[PDB]
């Protein structure tokens, strides 16, 4: 199981860093992709295969991957932009993995 910190503090008009620390068998081999989860609704694909993003995703997201860690940069945090954000990677033969998940705090 990957590890990412539980909370991210924020203020309107900041960017928040969100980080996921993998291993040589997890993030080392394959990319991470970051999901938004807004409890009650379907998880949403924010960042996949590192920097590239899905057509709908706002410009304000940038993910970045280090050798063993994944970092998520959210430009322009907003009140409505808060949601529990998850790490996900492909480890093993092909099973998907998920970091514990982290709930942003917009204030």
């Amino acid at each position: 199981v990957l590890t990412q910190p539980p909370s991210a503090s924020g203020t309107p008009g900041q960017t928040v860093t969100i980080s996921c620390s993998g291993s040589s068998s997890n993030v080392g081999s394959h990319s991470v992709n970051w999901y938004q989860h807004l409890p009650g609704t379907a998880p949403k694909l924010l960042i996949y295969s590192n920097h590239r993003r899905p057509s709908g995703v706002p410009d304000r997201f940038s993910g970045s991957k280090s050798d063993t860690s994944a970092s998520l940069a959210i430009s322009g945090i907003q009140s409505e932009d808060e949601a529990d954000y998850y790490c996900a990677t492909w480890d093993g033969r092909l099973n998907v993995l998920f970091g514990g998940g982290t709930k942003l705090t917009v204030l």
């Binding site: 081999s29 590192n50 991957k65 280090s66 050798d67």
Partner: protein, 462 residues
């Protein structure tokens, strides 16, 4: 011959005869089912036109292809020592291939438990392209090569190719190959396969360093790479990797010149500085796939060739400085070195012209290199309905295959004649005690090559 009868015999050997060598390494392969038996277009969507260089249009296929194209498949780190210390030059003669003990497993599901059962009567297609009609993807030093350590089962890489594009769209001059459309041999669980190939006549490799320098006929071509320092403090405090890059535009897409025409990686006495893209790079064992630190990768310094070749970080000369020089009557130069981990050959593309075809990454050039080998499973459809439905069958049994693969390559050598009174520079191990023998498995069992190994040791006159 039968299910019960073994179709071949494991051969791994090194036989040393006179001026020639023989290397056969048999390894174990595993082939999954790619794309659920569908040729599929791929295309690079990425941004809204921000990144233009990264555009590609091509097809993905079911066929997996055997890529043995890297040296360390064929030579054992002992032999590579044996081979490099004693022999000025070498080159392959005869290729041979035997693919046997094909087993088609039939992974299934049994009410919550996966089941890898036998399917005897399923078949395995295979064929060689001896006419080079297909794209040739062994040319870019791709991954999926046979495991360096004999005892590690590997997995066959997927095959796919690219064609002409304006942006992500295709163009009327494009070509869609279908690999089914070749005559192919269907190997069922008992049969085996083989073919033989004669390497076209190539110039010997040069494993040696000039005992003499050309200043003491003008040094070879140069195209300058920006100079990077392995100490981070010395480097400029800005992100210049893309900007620094030495590029060549083809069709309005700037591609980074890599690895670049053969030149010395650094000047004598300046080991740390290295060309940005001139040198080839390898990973260490289990090195991360993005943005890893310097000591996580191996950076091969070309220095051996410096005498004859212009340095890769310095301008050529004066007239104003000369940044890039081509060919002048009376130039001589040395090739780019080859590595235990570095490729063997490349396919000389089909052109009205070429110059000194020897491929840039090192190794040997050929017009008709050793053929490709494509192996896919044969689709087995799940029970189709009773009432005939013209749509094609989209539901197949899951299978995969496993077996052996063997390759026998006859190498030729060019013996050492030297009169040099003082003793050479030999490769050698270090004696100083350590926790792991180099090129040997650790406690976990992972097999790791600690250092790349270049082939220039001996010395010949200039």
């Amino acid at each position: 011959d039968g299910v019960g009868s073994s179709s071949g015999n494991w051969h791994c050997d090194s036989q040393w005869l006179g001026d020639r060598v023989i290397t056969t390494s048999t390894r174990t392969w595993a082939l999954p089912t790619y794309n659920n038996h569908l040729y599929k277009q791929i295309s690079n969507s990425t941004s809204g036109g921000s990144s233009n260089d990264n555009a590609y249009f091509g097809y993905s296929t079911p066929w997996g292809y055997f890529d043995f194209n890297r040296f360390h498949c064929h030579f054992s780190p002992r032999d590579w020592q044996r081979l490099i210390n004693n022999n000025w030059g070498f080159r392959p003669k005869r290729l041979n291939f035997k693919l046997f003990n094909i087993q088609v497993k039939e992974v299934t599901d049994n009410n919550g438990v996966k089941t890898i059962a036998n399917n005897l009567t399923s078949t395995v297609q295979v064929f060689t392209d001896s006419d080079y009609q297909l794209p040739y993807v062994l040319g870019s030093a791709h991954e999926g090569c046979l495991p360096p350590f004999p005892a590690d089962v590997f997995m066959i890489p997927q095959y796919g190719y690219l064609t002409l594009n304006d942006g992500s769209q295709a163009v009327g001059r494009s070509s869609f190959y279908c690999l089914e459309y070749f005559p192919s041999q269907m190997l069922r669980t008992g049969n085996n396969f083989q073919f033989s190939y004669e390497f076209e006549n190539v110039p010997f490799h040069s494993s040696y360093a000039h005992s003499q320098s050309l200043d003491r006929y003008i040094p070879g071509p140069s195209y300058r790479q920006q100079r990077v320092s392995t100490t981070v403090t010395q480097n400029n405090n800005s992100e210049f990797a893309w900007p620094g890059a030495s590029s060549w535009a083809l069709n309005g897409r700037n591609s980074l010149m890599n690895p670049g025409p053969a030149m010395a990686s650094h000047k004598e006495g300046e080991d740390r500085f290295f060309p940005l893209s001139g040198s080839l790079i390898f990973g260490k064992q289990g090195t991360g796939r993005d943005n890893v630190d310097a000591d996580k990768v191996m950076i091969t310094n070309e220095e051996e060739i410096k005498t004859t070749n212009p340095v890769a970080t310095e301008s050529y000369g004066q007239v104003g400085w000369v940044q890039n020089q081509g060919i002048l009557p009376g130039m001589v130069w040395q090739d780019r070195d080859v590595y235990l981990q570095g490729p063997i050959w490349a396919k000389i593309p089909h052109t009205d012209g070429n110059f000194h075809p020897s491929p840039l990454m090192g190794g040997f050039g050929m017009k008709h290199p050793p053929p490709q080998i494509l192996i896919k499973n044969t689709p087995v459809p799940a029970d189709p309905p009773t009432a005939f439905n013209k749509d094609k069958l989209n539901s197949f049994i899951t299978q995969y295959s496993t077996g052996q693969v063997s390759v026998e390559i006859e190498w030729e050598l060019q013996k050492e004649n030297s009169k040099r009174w003082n003793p050479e520079i030999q490769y050698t191990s270090n004696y100083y005690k350590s926790n792991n023998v180099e090129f040997a498995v650790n406690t976990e069992g992972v097999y790791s090559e600690p250092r790349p190994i270049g082939t220039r040791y001996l010395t010949r006159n200039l």
